[PDB]
Design a binder for these strands. Structure first.
Lengths: 50, 100, 413, 49, 50, 99
DNA sequence: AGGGCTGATCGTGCAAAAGTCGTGCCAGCCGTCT
DNA sequence: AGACGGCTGGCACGACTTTTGCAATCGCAGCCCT
């Protein structure tokens, strides 16, 4: 549902999913090129919260 | 619908958040202890009756390491909710329900 | 004392700084965005408007028409297949033989496909599933009553003099079709008024999308372009983010995070380079302008990018692509920083620079160009000479301005 | 009829044109939507027969 | 496809009585969804494509 | 492409333009019923290639090439009347001022 | 018991070849006027 | 009625640009190869 024609301006859970997509990316980022044991220390908590 | 693998675990926020937390009883963990486990602070002894730390017991990181030194890998202790993931993966009703 | 090229003499960015500055050479909005996503490290680097109106766009109208039209299962399937591959203008993209092949039925034949295409053409708008060109024109003419005059000659022009009118060969049309001189013009006009590309009429809504990367504003008549400051990417370092990186206490991960902070500081230099260059050089470019656009496009000359870089005075004439892949918006609209650069079009008459000014002079000449043709290379070149630029027929641009030759521009009045 | 039916809306409009007077129940889209919302949250959505 | 049954294939409904409500398994999660998401991108401002 | 009030509506009925000005405005004192065009802008669209079909279309009819899409304003549906008075405000530096 | 060799770390230029633009301007052609 | 005109652009050559295409030596000393 774009507002002014240019920007979609999505809201809420998808927007939350946006941040979750970060975590979804971060999970992939945790999957490779990050130490999941060392990373999920503060990452997994924010992951559960989000 | 799409999906996501979610390498960092995410137990259902609905699951055990309610006052009648079924998980908090199946693991029998304290509600504050459960909150710490979700907050990745509990470091509770994950499992194993052979190790000195109980299969379901809040294990200090020093205590968990000491028990690991004592009995090899028998000491398992996770701070995050994966502790609860095991605590329910281990919480058994197979003929245990009749005993209860 | 004096100087000498030979003496005991006491540099150039390599690898890491190369990709860094490339982030400036790359566009910051998207080209740098992919790399920023590819980073995947340095964790210490941070009523309701809802409306769901489902427009049909006349495709659902066609579906309701076929469903409401009396049709069999095979007839409905053929009509749906005909309606499926329709171009925007309204002419069928594929052929009837392709439709028969996609049907994959031996019983499905060219005759049934033709009947279905005629029935579809027997629906709004004129010339549905045109496939062949001017089918909209032929359908409109057939729909037009015979009481209309010049209709016979109009149909003759549309059916087989389609190339004759396409070449605007009015003399040849009169000589071949044997239509009356200066009277076949009325028939040609009647053929012209037949809703060509009527199907394109249905398509009228396109989304708006313009990214102002330096939005100069002139509602007040003049304003700082702001370099689209909010949209400018900016990573954030956080102390708690450093603490969480320490939570990633792995020594190899720690070294990785440290080197990542190093490369991220380098990239910070790159983005600052892009922004400061496209800020200072852009202020220099807008210095020629006063109160937003001063004299429209007639305000600049062939721009020396090396000159702007030497104005930045650090990578002096060390050219790059940072202002490139970045566009400044102004009262007229969005114009690139590459467009902030310019090229030499004026050739004599104290002219050696700026293609936009000469093109604007040509545009003013087109406001008074020749009627039988776009302003002839004599006409346009003489207009440019009156501007003193003297672009010559070498710039006379006419074929480049989508303007064909002179005599082909002669047409019936 | 007076609800979110799309494919039933078209069928009913065609029938009203043809004078058939028939509506097809099927299953509401909002039903599958709520099922998804269940699947969207932490619970599988599965309906038995 | 015969182009007469594939079109007819889309429109179908079951009685669907005895609707049940039960828990979840990750294999079923994989089966129900069609793909897994990893990037936070939703829509672009360059060419307006998925 | 900028949408400008030029009253140049491609693939349009002539009677609609009967009330418009060269500016595209309607002269003060007109009558209005239905969805009568009110302020007619034309939003230019993406340019086309050589496009032999579109090339032939521009050769035969031309001047539109579907380049301008209807960005026009029209009278409301179920609201009719007589135009009492008008006004306009353009961003400074834009000097259309046709009507 | 003696050698080697190793790489932790070492970022805002500018130039190379190459093109591309400026600019004109020669060959052809058809509208014309012859 | 065949040659002018001016269009055209192809044909050609210099002048501004301009992306790219180049990462290392330090630092001991210890561990590994001899």
């Amino acid at each position: 549902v774009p507002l002014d024609g240019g920007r979609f301006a999505t809201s809420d859970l998808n927007d939350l999913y946006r941040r979750v997509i970060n975590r979804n990316n971060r999970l992939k980022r945790l999957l490779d090129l990050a130490a999941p044991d060392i990373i999920v220390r503060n990452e997994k908590r924010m992951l559960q919260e989000a | 619908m799409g999906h996501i693998e979610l390498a960092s675990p995410t137990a259902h926020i609905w699951f055990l958040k309610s006052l009648p937390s079924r998980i908090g009883l199946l693991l029998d963990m304290p509600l504050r202890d459960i909150e710490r486990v979700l907050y990745f602070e509990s470091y509770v002894v994950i499992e194993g009756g052979m190790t000195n730390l109980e299969r379901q017991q809040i294990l200090t990181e020093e205590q968990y390491l000491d028990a690991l030194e004592e009995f090899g890998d028998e000491f398992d202790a996770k701070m995050g909710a994966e502790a609860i993931q095991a605590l329910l993966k281990s919480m058994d009703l197979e003929q245990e329900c009749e005993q209860l | 004392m004096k100087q000498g090229l030979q003496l005991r003499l006491s540099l150039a960015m390599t690898p890491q700084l190369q990709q860094a500055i490339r982030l400036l050479q790359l566009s910051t909005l998207e080209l740098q965005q992919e790399l920023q996503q590819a980073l995947e490290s340095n964790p210490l680097l941070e009523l309701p408007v809802y409306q769901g109106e489902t427009t049909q766009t006349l495709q659902d109208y066609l579906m309701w028409q076929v469903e409401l039209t009396p049709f069999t299962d095979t007839d409905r399937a053929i009509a749906t297949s005909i309606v499926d591959a329709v171009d925007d203008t309204g002419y069928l993209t594929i052929q009837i033989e392709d439709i028969v092949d996609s049907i994959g039925d031996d019983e499905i034949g060219l005759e049934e496909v033709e009947a279905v295409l005629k029935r579809i053409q027997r629906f709004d708008p004129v010339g549905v599933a045109a496939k062949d060109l001017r089918d909209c024109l032929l359908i409109q003419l057939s729909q037009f009553a015979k009481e209309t005059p010049w209709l016979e000659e109009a149909r003759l022009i549309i059916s087989d003099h389609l190339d004759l009118l396409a070449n605007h060969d009015f003399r040849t049309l009169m000589r071949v079709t044997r239509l009356k001189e200066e009277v076949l013009k009325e028939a040609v006009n009647l053929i012209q008024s037949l809703d060509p590309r009527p199907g394109q009429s249905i398509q009228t809504s396109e989304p708006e999308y313009v990214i102002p990367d330096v939005l100069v504003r002139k509602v007040s008549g003049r304003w700082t372009v702001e370099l689209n400051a909010d949209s400018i990417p900016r990573l954030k370092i956080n102390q708690q983010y450093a603490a969480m990186g320490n939570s990633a206490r792995n020594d190899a991960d720690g070294q990785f995070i440290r080197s990542n902070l190093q490369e991220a500081r380098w990239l910070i230099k790159s983005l600052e380079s892009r922004n400061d260059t496209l800020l200072r050089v852009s202020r220099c470019i807008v210095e020629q302008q006063q109160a937003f656009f001063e004299q429209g496009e007639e305000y600049m000359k062939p721009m020396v990018l090396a000159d702007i870089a030497q104005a930045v005075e650090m990578h002096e004439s060390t050219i790059s692509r940072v202002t490139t892949q970045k566009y400044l918006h102004s009262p007229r609209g969005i114009f690139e920083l590459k467009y902030f650069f310019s090229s030499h079009v004026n050739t004599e008459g104290g002219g050696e620079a700026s293609s936009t000014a000469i093109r604007a002079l040509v545009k003013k000449l087109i406001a008074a160009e020749n009627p039988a043709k776009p302003l002839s290379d004599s006409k346009l070149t003489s207009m440019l000479s009156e501007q003193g630029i003297m672009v010559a027929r070498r710039t006379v641009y006419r074929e480049s301005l989508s303007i064909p030759p002179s005599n082909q521009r002669k047409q019936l009045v | 009829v007076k609800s979110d039916d799309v494919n039933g809306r078209t069928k009913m409009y065609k029938n009203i044109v043809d004078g058939n007077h028939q509506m097809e129940p099927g299953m509401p889209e909002s039903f599958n939507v709520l099922l998804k919302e269940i699947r969207s949250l932490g619970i599988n959505i599965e309906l038995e027969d | 496809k015969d182009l007469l049954k594939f079109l007819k294939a889309q429109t179908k409904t079951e009685e669907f009585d005895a609707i049940k409500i039960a828990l979840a398994s990750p294999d079923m999660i994989r089966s129900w969804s069609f793909g897994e998401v990893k990037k936070p991108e939703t829509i672009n401002y360059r060419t307006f494509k998925p | 492409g900028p949408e400008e009030i030029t009253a140049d509506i491609p693939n349009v009925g002539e009677a609609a333009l009967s009330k418009l000005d060269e500016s595209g405005i309607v002269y003060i004192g007109a009558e209005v019923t239905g969805g009568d065009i009110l302020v007619g802008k034309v939003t230019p669209k993406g340019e086309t290639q050589l496009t032999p079909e579109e090339k032939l279309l521009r050769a035969i009819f031309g001047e539109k090439a579907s380049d301008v899409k209807d960005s026009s304003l029209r009278v409301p549906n179920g609201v009719s009347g007589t135009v009492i008075d008008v006004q306009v405000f353009t961003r400074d530096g834009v000097e259309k001022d046709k009507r």
